UniProtKB/Swiss-Prot annotation:
Belongs to the spectrin family. The lineage of its organism: Eukaryota, Metazoa, Chordata, Craniata, Vertebrata. Like erythrocyte spectrin, the spectrin-like proteins are capable of forming dimers which can further associate to tetramers. Interacts with ACP1. The chain holds residues 969 to 1025 of 2477 of the full protein. It comes from Gallus gallus. This is Spectrin alpha chain, non-erythrocytic 1. It is found in: Cytoplasm, Cytoskeleton; Cytoplasm, Cell cortex. Morphologically, spectrin-like proteins appear to be related to spectrin, showing a flexible rod-like structure. They can bind actin but seem to differ in their calmodulin-binding activity. In nonerythroid tissues, spectrins, in association with some other proteins, may play an important role in membrane organization. The gene is SPTAN1. Residues 1-57 form the SH3 domain.
């Protein structure tokens, strides 16, 4: 889907989550949830907080 810019670093804290670093360009897999968005970063998909990423449309 779209691409999102990681605005902060975020280390996963749950098994469905994924870790990212600030500046990371991630692929937006699912944005139906207002709080968690499923993204793809270096081979891993999973959720991160929606407020920590930004859409590049």
């Amino acid at each position: 889907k779209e691409l999102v810019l990681a605005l902060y670093d975020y280390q996963e804290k749950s098994p469905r989550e994924v870790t990212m670093k600030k500046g990371d360009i991630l692929t937006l897999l699912n944005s139906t949830n207002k709080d968690w968005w499923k993204v793809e970063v270096n081979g891993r998909q999973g959720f991160v907080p929606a407020a920590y990423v930004k859409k590049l449309d």
